[PDB]
């Protein structure tokens, strides 16, 4: 059994281990999933990286409330696809708060 947390963080892969032995981000390429899902997960992480204001990070954010909603909406759908592709050998938990 392995827990995988789906969660975007700046300049990280959007997948995380949840025990002290495997803390840290996880490349989608390390998981037994489809190329399409790997690409979708990396596209979602790229959208989060884009909200970072690197020169003044306190100003980071989405362009609108609706853009944030769409980002969170899409993460739910990716988490559900990830759980389906990984089956019962993995437990997916989605971090929904941004």
């Amino acid at each position: 059994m392995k827990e995988i947390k789906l969660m975007a963080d700046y300049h990280c892969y959007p997948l995380w281990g949840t025990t002290p032995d495997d803390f840290g981000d996880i490349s989608p390429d390390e998981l037994p999933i489809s190329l399409g899902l790997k690409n979708s997960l990396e596209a979602w992480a790229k959208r989060y990286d884009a909200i970072l204001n690197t020169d003044d990070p306190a100003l980071s954010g989405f362009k609108s409330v609706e853009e944030e909603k769409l980002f969170i909406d899409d993460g739910y759908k990716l988490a559900e696809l990830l759980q389906e592709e990984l089956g019962s050998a993995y437990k997916v938990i989605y971090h929904a708060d941004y």
Partner: protein, 119 residues
């Protein structure tokens, strides 16, 4: 002193409220690094809401997160990068006599954006 660092942050053009600052120090190359209370998008609250459970599991209380993250990024040694190998730097650091790796993203102005433990 923190008062001297605040004067230096001020002259370099950083706009900040002292009560929002929870850590500030220089790294070994003289860059001022500082951590603010923040919100879900950046800073301490972003670290805690995203990765606070990591610290809980290794016995580091929430109140200690600022000091631990600050020590990593100002005194730690870069040993790798997250993401595809060019993302968030991973700092080797020491917590209570034990070695840990802590990855930390910092803005160009020294503001600590986010951080996480590694195995």
């Amino acid at each position: 002193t923190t008062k001297s660092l605040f004067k230096e942050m001020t002259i370099q053009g950083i706009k900040f409220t002292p009560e929002n600052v929870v850590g500030a120090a220089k790294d070994n190359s003289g860059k001022i690094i500082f951590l603010e209370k923040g919100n879900s998008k950046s800073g301490l609250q972003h670290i805690v809401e995203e990765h606070g459970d990591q610290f809980a599991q290794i016995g580091v209380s929430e109140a200690r997160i600022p000091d631990v993250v600050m020590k990593a990024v100002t005194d730690g040694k870069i040993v790798g990068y997250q993401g595809a190998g060019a993302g968030r730097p991973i700092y080797e650091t020491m917590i209570d006599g034990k070695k840990y790796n802590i990855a930390v993203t910092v803005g160009s102005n020294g503001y600590v954006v986010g951080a996480n433990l590694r195995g």
